Amino acid sequence: LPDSVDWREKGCVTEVKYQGSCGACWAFSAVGALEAQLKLKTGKLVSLSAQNLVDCSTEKYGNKGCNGGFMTTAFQYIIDNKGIDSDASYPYKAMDQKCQYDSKYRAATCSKYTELPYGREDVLKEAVANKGPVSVGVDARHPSFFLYRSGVYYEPSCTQNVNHGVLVVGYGDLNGKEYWLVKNSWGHNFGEEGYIRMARNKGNHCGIASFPSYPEI
Numbered sequence: 001l002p003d004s005v006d007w008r009e010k011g012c013v014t015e016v017k018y019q020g021s022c023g024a025c026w027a028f029s030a031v032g033a034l035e036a037q038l039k040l041k042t043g044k045l046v047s048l049s050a051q052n053l054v055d056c057s058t059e060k061y062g063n064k065g066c067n068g069g070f071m072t073t074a075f076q077y078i079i080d081n082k083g084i085d086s087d088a089s090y091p092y093k094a095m096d097q098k099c100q101y102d103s104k105y106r107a108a109t110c111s112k113y114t115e116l117p118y119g120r121e122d123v124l125k126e127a128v129a130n131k132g133p134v135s136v137g138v139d140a141r142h143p144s145f146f147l148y149r150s151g152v153y154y155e156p157s158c159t160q161n162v163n164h165g166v167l168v169v170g171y172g173d174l175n176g177k178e179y180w181l182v183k184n185s186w187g188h189n190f191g192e193e194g195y196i197r198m199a200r201n202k203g204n205h206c207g208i209a210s211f212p213s214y215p216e217i
């Protein structure tokens with residue numbers, strides 16, 4: 001496996017999004033993962049509709065729109081639904097709306113998804129390198145997370161109780177510290193242009209390898 005990976009360099013990552021006061025990070029994580037697969041399969045980078053998931057991947061999938069959801073069940077919704085609309089056709093409003101899916105605006109599909117074994121950072125490393133960006137959950141409840149600006153994020157108070165959906169788009173080493181390159185959905189003002197380098201191989205720090213999953217087309 002390569003010592004470092006960065007899917008942004010392969011044009012497989014769309015711009016950072018801003019979720020606002022709607023807890024749709026799970027949906028942004030989900031579309032982000034599918035966005036990379038879509039690029040690998042068709043050669044086109046296209047932002048997918050996180051709103052589509054918020055309004056449509058609801059109760060039947062155990063999701064609660066702006067009040068939280070699962071990346072895996074979101075993937076199953078796309079499979080069951082036979083598609084997901086583009087962000088452009090079904091824009092993000094940061095609120096719970098009625099399902100407005102329309103196949104005429106479909107920009108991607110999903111045939112299956114895979115959930116990686118709990119806490120195995122070596123397995124996650126292989127997935128990011130051989131499959132593409134992977135959806136994961138992290139413990140982002142600590143004050144230090146909101147204030148992160150650079151370097152590699154390491155928080156002694158972090159736990160393996162995840163509550164925030166994000167996307168691992170790479171990994172590497174910075175000044176002797178191994179890290180996971182994570183795409184967040186709190187806009188470009190958060191951390192490094194919307195990204196945060198989180199400690200890697202440090203005991204499943206903040207539970208980054210607790211619940212990883214990725215879709216396939």
Ligand SMILES: N#CCNC(=O)[C@H](CS(=O)(=O)Cc1ccccc1OC(F)F)OC(=O)N1CCOCC1
Binds near residue numbers: 063137163211
């Ligand atoms: N709001 C908001 C923003 N946060 C969310 O959407 C989070 C994103 S997650 O932690 O990665 C989902 C999750 C996946 C596997 C195991 C535990 C999880 O996380 C779980 F919280 F433990 O989910 C939730 O908070 N949920 C609570 C309601 O039911 C759906 C999941």
